[PDB]
Structure 1
Amino acid sequence: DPCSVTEYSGLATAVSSCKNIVLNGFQVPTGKQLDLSSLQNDSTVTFKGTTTFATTADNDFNPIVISGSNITITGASGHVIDGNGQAYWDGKGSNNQKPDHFIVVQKTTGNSKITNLNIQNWPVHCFDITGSSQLTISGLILDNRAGDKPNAKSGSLPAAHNTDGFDISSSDHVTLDNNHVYNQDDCVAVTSGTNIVVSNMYCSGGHGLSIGSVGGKSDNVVDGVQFLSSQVVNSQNGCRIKSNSGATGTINNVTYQNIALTNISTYGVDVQQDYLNGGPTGKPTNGVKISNIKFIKVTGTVASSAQDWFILCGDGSCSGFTFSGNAITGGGKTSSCNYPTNTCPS
């Protein structure tokens, strides 16, 4: 059966010829890509057993790539996709070479879906979604909890770093629903896109639900993102919007609605326009417009180390912020906002 893949050598044949493909749980050899970029229209790929990867210490290497139209990638009971993360982690993340993108979803269109995948131990960023349209990703568990501890190369630091769950760019009508992410960086990060929906997420250990950092990239327009009915726990931030200093662009129509926070270390809500090379400058610029941002029923408790709210907009670059029913409490550092007024909600 050419459509039932039991070893890497049989994959290409199946992708070329088959509309229903089963991957039975094998190790992908070093430097070799689990290449689903040529999937036929209306094809289905089902993961079974445990899929593993040999070590490929290469920043530019992408282990799994997905592309096609009206495709389905899904998982059967008991399946596991292991990303060999333990072989790479060194406390420093994207800064020892490590494949930067574990799964690339590119040019995937036409009501495609990725459902019910069980993924653990991935090297750096997990999903990189790009150039796609009408895509649903639902029911996934991304478990990188094994990276929380230090290892033989990370000194005192957590071994896994920069382990974003879902990065989205240059995509339209993407829905992320009912996914669990245990990681060490952004649960979701949207740097560009339109009509993005992120619903029923459970995000633990990372940096929260984020727009940005926007600006200076190939696409610098974010328009219409909804973060709905989600949990953020044990994370650096709850809700976050960032734009890069000196850049131009637009963040418009972003809603955080019914977001529950527990044990947030740094910012309940964080909106700032002063980011320069992954760090704040304190001097926001006004080339990136941020407009029609709603925080509706963002509630819960943040850690004593945190500020409940932080807003640092540039001059005239922020407009139309709406606050309703929020209850972010517990911060021991006084909150700080410069828009809409000089006072925060909490």
Structure 2
Amino acid sequence: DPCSVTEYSGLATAVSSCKNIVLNGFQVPTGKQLDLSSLQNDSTVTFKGTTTFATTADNDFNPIVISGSNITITGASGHVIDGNGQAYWDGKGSNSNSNQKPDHFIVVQKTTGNSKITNLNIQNWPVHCFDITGSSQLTISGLILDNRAGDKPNAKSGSLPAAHNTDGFDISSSDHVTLDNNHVYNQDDCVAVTSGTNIVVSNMYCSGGHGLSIGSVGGKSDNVVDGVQFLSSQVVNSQNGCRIKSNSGATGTINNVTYQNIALTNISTYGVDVQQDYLNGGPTGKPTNGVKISNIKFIKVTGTVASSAQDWFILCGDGSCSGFTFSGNAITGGGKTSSCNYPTNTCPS
């Protein structure tokens, strides 16, 4: 059965001959990418057994690539997809001057036609997990990203957490993307939308990450975010719950963004963060107004933040923010006075 792949060498043929392909769980040899960019229309790929990856010390290497129209990527019960992160982690993540590691584990580009990815068990990935770009009408649910193994330090990170910059879902230049019922244990942004339209993220279980954050926007290929919805979700043991960041000195657009029904728990620094002073992955303290943020809604954002974090932190640019709505929020716990500068110099406290 050509449609039943037992080894990497049988993948190509399966993708060209079968609309229903079954990966039985093998190891992808070093330097070889699990190429699913040529999937036929209405094709279905099912992950079985344990899929593993050989070690490929290269930043630009992309282990898995998915493309096609009306395609379906799912897994069978008890299946597992290991990214071989333990072999890469050195607690520096995507840092240029660190050990070389695949930046994007899974690249979902050019996926359309009401395609969907569901019920996937992914674990131990290098850096960024999902790189969703140039896709539309796509649905991802029932996903379980577990990178807790990278929480502890190894022989390469010293006292640092092996895993770093392990974004769960990165979305860009996409439209009508829906994320529902997804578990994410990582060390960075649970879900980062640098650009896209009509994006929906609901029933999200983030933990140990940086929370559902927007951006950073600006300075990238695409700096336009219009129509994003974070609904019924839980952010625990994370740096931030709801964060909207923008690169300093850059231009872009962030409109129609709504955080609704978000429960926070044990936030480290920011319960709700909205700043436009990000430079080189770090806050500058001086926000710019190149990126226009408008129509932002914080509805029913409750929960608690660690004593070491601020309930609210809003650092908008000079006249670059407009239309902020706050309703039903109840964030408590912060040991540092909240600070924000829009719409006025007072916050929800």
Task: Name the TM-score class by shorter chain.
Answer: over 0.9
Q: SS where residue 235 of structure 1 aligns?
A: coil
Partner-residue secondary structure (3-state), 1:162: coil
1:37-96 per-position Cα deviation (integer Å, ceiling 9, x unaligned): 000000000000000011001000010000000000000101000010000000000951
Q: Spell out, residue by residue over 1:229-256, the C-alpha distance to the aligned partner (whole angstroms, 9 max, x if none).
A: 0000000000000111111111000000
Q: Give the root-mean-square deviation of aligned CA atoms.
A: 0.7
Query: In structure 1, what is the Cα distance between the partners aligned to 2:285 and 2:333?
Result: 24
Q: 1:282: how far off? A: 1.1
Where 1:16 maps in the other structure, the secondary structure is helix
Q: Taking structure 1 as reference, are residues 214 and 95 closer, same or farther at Cα in structure 2, changes over 3 Å only? A: farther
Q: 2:330 aligns with which of 327, 331, 337?
A: 327
DSSP 3-state at the match of 2:122:
strand
Where structure 2 has 5 or more consecutive residues not aligned to the other structure, the ranges are: none
Q: Secondary structure at the match of 1:139?
A: strand
Q: Which residue of 1 aligns with 2:37?
A: 37
Structure 1 distance, partners of 2:111, 2:244, is 26
Instruction: Give the Cα–Cα distance (whole angstroms) in 2 for the partners of residues 302 and 156 of structure 1.
Output: 25
The 4+ residue runs of structure 1 with deviation greater than 3 A are none
1:100 maps to 2:103: yes
Structure 1 pair 71–247 and aligned structure 2 pair: CA distance change class (3 A): same
Deviation at 1:216, TM superposition (A): 1.0
Which digits, 9 at most, give the CA deviation of each residue in 1:116-165, with x for residues without a partner? 00000000000000000000000000000000000000011110000000
Question: Which sits farther off after the overlay, 86-95 or 75-84?
Answer: 86-95
Shift of 1:189: 0.1
- The answer to whether the 8 A contact 2:255-2:294 is kept is yes
More off after superposition, 162-171 vs 277-286: 277-286
Is contact 2:90-2:98 (8 Å) kept? no
TM (norm. structure 2) is: 0.98
Q: Secondary structure at the match of 2:267?
A: coil
Q: Tell me how far apart the structure 2 counterparts of residues 55 and 279 of structure 1 sit (CA, whole Å).
A: 31
1:288 to partner: Cα distance:
0.4
- Give the 3-state SS of the residue equivalent to 2:15 in structure 1: helix
Identity %: 99
Displacement of 1:17 in angstroms is 1.2
Deviations 1:85-118 (A, max 9, x none): 0000000009510000000000000100000000
CA distance in 2, matches of 1:60, 1:247: 25
Q: How does 1:276-295 map to 2 (within 5 A)?
A: 276-295=279-298
- For 1:50 and 1:216, the matched residues in 2 are separated by 39
Deviation at 1:295, TM superposition (A): 0.4
